[PDB]
Amino acid sequence: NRKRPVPKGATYGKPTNQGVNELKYQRSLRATAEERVGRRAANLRVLNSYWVNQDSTYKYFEVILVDPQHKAIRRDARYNWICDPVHKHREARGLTATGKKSRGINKGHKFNNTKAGRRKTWKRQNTLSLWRYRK
């Protein structure tokens, strides 16, 4: 789990937020692995990753990275899409497979909260839409 980084377990609030120990990170270990690997090889673009091993203390993943400035990848038009700049730090934005899984981006009645983006959806249903001729 993710132990809350509070000194001596003090939260200074209601008990609900006073709980400290059994809190869980909302992103996956795959997600943080890809984020760390991308932060290391910032000149590369993270494509995907997979689980390879695990023990009691560690989970082991292998992440694929693409060189956006390698000439074959600039050519070889199957990968100019990742050469494009809108894909900078996909793993940081949560755009990878595990990132989208953690964000809950799926079609259906089970993902009404997070289907076009959780915060975008919440904003949409929390705006007060006023027209010129009030309806």
Binding site: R75, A77, R78, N80, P85
Partner: protein
């Protein structure tokens, strides 16, 4: 008055260096005069002339190295385009227009038709 860039370009590199050194000497003498006298803009005129000579020398040297590097890739970074960092990182026109053989065949076989509805 002030020297002019066109005759500066007509004159040679040794003439340019000699003119620059004489302009510096005249600047020093005129600056002693400024120290000894209330006001005079001939110092600004001389500084402008020195700047003109220096920029002519710089442009001729840069043109020489550009012609040295003409026709070959890996030009010095002071000679390549300064458009924008994002633009330089961006895909070239050939790279963007590159398509796979499958998509090329698809586009060749089934392009967008120029149809119209009248009757």
């Amino acid at each position: 008055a002030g020297v002019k860039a066109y005759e500066l370009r007509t004159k040679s590199k040794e003439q340019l260096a000699s003119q620059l050194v004489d302009l510096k000497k005249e600047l020093a003498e005129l600056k002693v005069q400024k120290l000894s006298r209330p006001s005079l803009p001939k110092i600004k005129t001389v500084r402008k002339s020195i700047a003109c000579v220096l920029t002519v020398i710089n442009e001729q040297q840069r043109e020489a190295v550009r012609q040295l590097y003409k026709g070959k890739k890996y030009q010095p970074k002071d000679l390549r385009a300064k458009k924008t960092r994002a633009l330089r990182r961006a895909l070239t026109k050939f790279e963007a227009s590159q398509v796979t053989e499958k998509q090329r065949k698809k586009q060749i076989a089934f392009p967008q038709r120029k149809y119209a509805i009248k009757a």
